[PDB]
């Protein structure tokens, strides 16, 4: 509530429950190879 | 020397833990080698 940012980019999609925990940068391995990769220096929130 | 890492060979680190986590082992090895170089340079300064 007390930080400022240049811009906020929101990305939305749908996956199964088994893949929800895979959005973590380390856990991205299976998803990242073909579908969706989150940067190692990611700064933000993941909401599902 | 190992400096508490899964291996002491640099390339083995790059082919056994994947970029998301091998950075930690790389960092540990980096700190160990840098400390050793520090000790060598300080000994050299005193001897000089």
Contact B19/A at CB under 8 A: yes
Instruction: Answer for the pair A46, A23: CB distance below 8 angstroms, yes or no.
Output: yes
HEC per residue, chain B: CCCCCCCCCHHHHCCCCHHHHHHHHHHHHHHHHHHHHHHHHHHHHHHC
Q: How far apart are the C-alpha atoms of A28 and A4, rounded to whole Å?
A: 28
Instruction: Answer for the pair B41, B35: CB distance below 8 angstroms, yes or no.
Output: no
Elucidated via: cryo-EM
Residue at token pair 């990242």: A32
- Burial group, residue A33, by CB count within 10 angstroms (0-12, 13-18, 19+): exposed
Q: Per the structure block, which two tokens stand in for A42? A: 């990611």
Contacts of A26 in chain B (CB under 8 A): 20-21
Residue of B nearest to A28 (CA): B20
Residues 6+ apart with CB under 8 A from B33: B3
Contact A33/B at CB under 8 A: no
CA angle A30, A32, A14 (to 5 degrees): 90
Instruction: Answer for the pair B41, B33: CB distance below 8 angstroms, yes or no.
Output: no
Under DSSP, the state recorded for A21 is: G
CA-based nearest distance B19→chain A, Å: 9
């Amino acid at each position: 509530n007390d930080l400022c940012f240049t811009n906020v980019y929101a990305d939305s999609f749908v996956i199964r429950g088994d893949e929800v925990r895979q959005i973590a940068p380390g856990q991205t391995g299976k998803i990242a190879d073909y579908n969706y990769k989150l940067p190692d220096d990611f700064t933000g929130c993941v909401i599902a | 020397s190992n400096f508490g890492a899964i291996s002491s060979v640099l390339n083995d680190i790059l082919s056994r833990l994947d970029p998301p986590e091998a950075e930690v082992q790389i960092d540990r090895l980096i700190t160990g080698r840098l400390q050793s170089l520090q000790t060598y340079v300080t000994q050299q300064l005193i001897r000089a």
